[PDB]
């Protein structure tokens, strides 16, 4: 019958436009939005009818309920709010036109309404129409009970029409992005745009998207990060830069992952990772406080039917050292940080991993074993925002070596709800060391790991003109959005998420 | 010789590393910016030395000049400004350190400086160092002198270091984008993000980029516009939306074109192209006045060597109807607008094009002949911002039919300096007619060339739930940036422009 409904309504509207009654008018002049209509006339007492005030409003009909005969009620929704249209035959321009327009309208139709403010005896704020105009028809039968995720994601307009909390979620996302922009702008950062199509992909670890250019006979890669360009701009003499933009990583699609996602990266000259830690603290805490009204946010990792945790964004965030506290959590002593590239150390980590029953699928390397181990014993203890610091050099090819600690780097990751929302480090400004680490990555690429970084000679050349001491920073926007919208699925914070056929 | 310089300096810095003097230190604490230093201490009289005040500043050396025994002057630049470092061994930590650090430093090096505010006998504001620290060396010899555009564009960091106006250009760009954001946000628009990877490309006429998605095992297209998603979100009940983002169109590279470029598209419910014309007037004029100080801005189309024109952004912008004023410019009456799709009128326009010596390379079709004639007789007429309005339906498949004019649409393009910075129209909300036009041009794609748009079934399906009367708008950000930065090349307003060697 929904199919038949579609057929019938299609035909009706069709002969409507055949008869020249214009079911799709060009322009309707709206005097006031529904929201401040509500704000303005909410003070009215039940039974009130203001005959000398005429207003034009517009919206979508979410319900149509007849009292029969001379009276009919329309549920008019828009802007996430509600207004009742009480259409009384005697209050209409004429009975005939009242009848005619009422027989035409259906649930889901976009209509304009010209009428008087008022309030029903039931106490409902309403508008009493002089004339109702159909702005555009809905040819499909609108759902009754959309509680299923996939249908919601594939058609987002239905989800937005029927579900307000969706609108609220994307509002929250927008608020986040704008807040970050304000925060960085007022700190003297320059909002920049860097190429999203590169000769050689870099700045991160992931499988790239490949495309062809119809001018240059060459192939091109979609960017997995903005890092190198930003650092090159810092080399250029622009001391503070930031970009909130789309980043492409071709990989699995899951609750925390989407092939294309929005990230924010900023680079700050003369800053180190400590500075960025405090700046991160106040940015995140201030964001959470401004948006949610508090430092503490309730979040459901398993969904509304599961247990909820309270996340406390009150600064300062807890700081943890990776290797150190990994030794604490393992109850074992790890090799000194200078020895980590040794196959002996790799064997030690292997035996520790198998002793703790921590699975590490092939290829089995010091870095993968360490990552899975940290993921098991450390990341799980992060509910409140938590800094995991001082990563080994092997896990951080672009990070500057730790000043006091042999074999480590100056780097931190910010974890909320066991997930990583931030990655930042003191930038490596030494061109020789950078090119060497790139050499190791290149050799490891030609044999081992294929998502391993490719040597960028332009970037090293840029480093040869010199890079002031600088700290870089980056944040997944979508994940932060998830946590501030109370979403366990990234598809919730994406308007049109990638979906499988 | 510069090569020899690179080798020598590289060897020297490497040996600084071997000797453990740390040419790339981790952290230097900057007390005050160069700008703040300059404006705070500019009140000093020549000869002043403040021994009570000690500050730390940092920057890049653009010059090194020695009195040569005990006295060395450094020209220290950063933040688009300059500060002199006057180093005499008497005021240094000790003479020995003075000698050492001065023998270490070269032009182009990033240095920190700890010292006192002062002013030279010549009256130049300076800082007199207690100690100078090398933050990072420059291994290359800097141009004395970087005029060649190719070199400027390929290495942007060099251009930013040596040329001060570049920074101002990109600052102006950022100001433009931020201004547009403030404008639309304040008008109650929601800033949104829509997929940059589409199954079916649409929203404009362009040759697309093609890429492959691994997990989904299918090809996807890079977006040529955000239009359809936005309109679908308007369907969803979000009345006002906007996106400033990257758009990919795979085509020729020239002064006005880049394969990837930034566009801003917004969509406004219950508005038509008139409203958007007024809004465009206010936005553009307000932008130009806010950024440049006035409504009038000087622009060189052929460059500094050529003539400059005065562009007057004072509202209202001049309006011209395409067909009417084309008739008036040709001195010929064209066919009635309802006849524009017949072969006859096309033949007429062929005759007019050959009579006016207006060249139209094959295929010669009505649309392209119209485009060439309008381009020749009309687009050149626009120096000040000018609205070209009421395009024929054949040139506007996505535009709603003109209410008072049959064969035309409600649409306008905004032209500044003969170039098109804006495209906007009253959105076509009729699903049947839309699918019809789509199917005509799909029938053209089947008629044997690829220019014409692909049919989006999901978009029409979305239109079947109905689209409120809506107007929509888009703007090239890069071109606007060009005109406000006085640039005749788009590569000037792009940080790392696409290059063809």
């Amino acid at each position: 019958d929904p199919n038949q409904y579609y057929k019938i309504r299609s035909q009706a509207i069709h002969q409507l436009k055949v008869n020249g009654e214009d079911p799709y008018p060009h322009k309707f002049h709206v005097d006031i939005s529904l929201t401040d209509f509500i704000q303005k006339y909410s003070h009215l007492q039940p039974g009130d009818h203001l005959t000398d005030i005429t207003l034009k409003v517009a919206g979508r009909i979410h319900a149509k309920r007849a009292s029969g005969g001379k009276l009919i009620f329309y549920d008019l929704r828009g802007e996430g709010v509600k207004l009742q249209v009480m259409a009384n035959s005697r209050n209409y321009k004429s009975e005939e036109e009242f009848i005619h327009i009422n027989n035409k309208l259906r649930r889901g139709d976009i209509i304009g309404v010209q009428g008087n403010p008022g309030k029903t005896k039931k106490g409902e704020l309403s508008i009493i129409p002089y004339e109702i105009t159909l702005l555009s028809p809905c040819l499909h039968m609108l759902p009754h009970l959309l509680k299923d995720k996939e249908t919601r994601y594939r058609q987002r307009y239905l989800d937005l029409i029927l579900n307000d909390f969706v609108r609220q979620k994307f509002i929250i996302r927008s608020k986040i992005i704008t807040y970050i922009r304000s925060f960085l702008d007022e700190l003297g950062f320059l909002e920049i745009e860097t190429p999203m199509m590169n000769i050689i992909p870099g700045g991160a670890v992931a499988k790239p998207f490949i495309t062809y250019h119809n001018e240059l006979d060459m192939n091109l890669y979609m960017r997995i990060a903005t890092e190198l360009y930003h650092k090159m701009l810092v080399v250029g003499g622009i001391d503070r830069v930031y970009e909130i933009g789309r980043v492409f990583r071709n990989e699995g699609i899951d609750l925390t992952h989407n092939p294309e996602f929005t990230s924010c990266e900023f680079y700050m000259a003369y800053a180190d990772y400590h500075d960025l830690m405090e700046i991160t603290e106040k940015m995140v805490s201030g964001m959470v406080k401004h948006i949610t009204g508090s430092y503490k946010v309730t979040y459901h990792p398993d969904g509304p039917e599961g247990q909820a945790y309270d996340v406390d964004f009150t600064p300062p965030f807890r700081r943890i050292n990776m290797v150190e506290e990994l030794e604490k959590a393992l109850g074992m002593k790890l090799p000194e940080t200078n020895l980590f590239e040794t196959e002996e150390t790799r064997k030690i980590l292997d035996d520790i991993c198998v002793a703790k029953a921590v699975e590490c699928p092939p290829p089995r390397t010091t870095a993968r074993l360490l990552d899975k181990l940290v993921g098991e014993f450390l990341e799980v203890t992060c509910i409140n925002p938590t800094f995991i610091c001082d990563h080994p050099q092997i896990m951080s090819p672009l990070a500057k070596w730790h000043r006091s600690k042999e074999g480590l780097t100056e780097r931190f990751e910010l974890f909320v709800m066991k997930k990583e929302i931030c990655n930042a480090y003191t930038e490596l400004n030494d061109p020789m060391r950078q090119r060497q680490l790139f050499e190791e990555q290149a050799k490891a690429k030609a044999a081992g790991d294929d998502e391993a970084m490719f040597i960028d000679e332009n970037f090293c050349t840029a480093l040869e003109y010199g890079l002031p001491p600088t700290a870089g920073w980056g944040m997944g926007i979508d994940r932060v959005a998830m946590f501030l919208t109370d979403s366990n699925n990234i598809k919730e914070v994406l308007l049109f998420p990638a979906m499988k056929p | 010789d510069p090569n020899q310089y690179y080798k020598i300096r590289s060897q020297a810095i490497h040996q600084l590393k071997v000797n453990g003097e740390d040419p790339y230190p981790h952290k230097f604490h900057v007390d005050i910016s160069l700008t703040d230093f300059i404006q705070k201490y500019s009140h000093l009289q020549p000869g002043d030395h403040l021994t009570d005040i000690t500050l730390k500043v940092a920057g890049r050396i653009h010059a090194k000049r020695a009195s040569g025994g005990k006295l060395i002057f450094y020209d220290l630049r950063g933040e688009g400004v300059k500060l002199q470092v006057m180093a005499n061994s008497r005021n240094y930590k000790s003479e020995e350190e003075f000698i050492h650090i001065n023998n270490k430093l070269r032009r182009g090096d990033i240095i920190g400086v700890q010292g006192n505010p002062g002013k030279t006998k010549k009256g130049e504001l300076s800082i007199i160092p207690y100690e100078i620290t090398l933050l990072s060396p420059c291994l290359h010899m800097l141009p004395h002198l970087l005029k060649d555009k190719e070199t400027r564009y390929r290495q942007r960091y060099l251009d930013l270091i040596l040329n001060d106006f570049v920074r101002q250009k990109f600052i102006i760009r950022s100001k433009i984008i931020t201004y547009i954001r403030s404008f639309l946000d304040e008008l109650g628009f929601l800033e949104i993000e829509t997929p940059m990877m589409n199954i079916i490309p649409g929203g404009a006429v362009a040759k697309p980029f093609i890429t492959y998605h691994n997990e989904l095992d299918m090809n996807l297209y890079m977006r040529i516009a955000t239009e359809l998603y936005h309109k679908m979100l308007v369907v969803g009940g979000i009345d006002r939306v906007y996106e400033i983002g990257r758009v990919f169109r795979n085509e020729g590279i020239d002064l006005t074109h880049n394969p990837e470029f930034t566009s801003c598209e917004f969509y406004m419910a219950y508005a038509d192209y008139h409203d958007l014309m007024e809004i465009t007037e206010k936005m553009v004029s307000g932008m130009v006045k806010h950024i440049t100080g006035s409504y009038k801005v000087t622009y060189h189309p052929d460059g500094p060597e050529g003539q400059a024109y005065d562009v007057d952004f004072t509202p209202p912008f001049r309006r011209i109807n395409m067909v009417e004023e084309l008739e008036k410019a040709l001195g010929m009456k064209l066919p009635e607008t309802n006849l524009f799709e017949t072969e006859e009128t096309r033949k007429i326009l062929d005759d007019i094009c050959v009579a006016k010596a207006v060249e139209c390379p094959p295929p010669r079709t009505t649309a392209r002949l119209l485009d060439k004639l309008v381009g020749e007789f009309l687009e050149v007429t626009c120096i000040n911002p000018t609205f070209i309005c009421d395009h024929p339906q054949i040139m506007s498949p996505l535009a709603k039919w003109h209410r008072s004019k049959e064969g035309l649409t409600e649409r306008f393009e905004l032209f500044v300096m003969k170039k098109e910075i804006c495209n906007a129209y009253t959105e076509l909300n009729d699903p049947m007619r839309q699918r019809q036009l789509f199917e005509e041009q799909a029938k053209a794609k089947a008629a044997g060339d690829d220019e014409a748009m692909f049919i989006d079934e999901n978009f029409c399906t979305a239109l079947e739930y109905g689209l409120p009367p809506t107007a929509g708008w888009g703007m090239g950000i890069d071109r606007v940036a060009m005109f406000l930065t006085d640039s005749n090349n788009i590569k000037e307003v792009l940080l790392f422009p696409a290059m063809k060697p």
Partner: peptide, 9 residues
């Protein structure tokens, strides 16, 4: 806390 730089806007 990092040193202060005037906003570009």
């Amino acid at each position: 806390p990092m040193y202060q730089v005037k906003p570009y806007h």
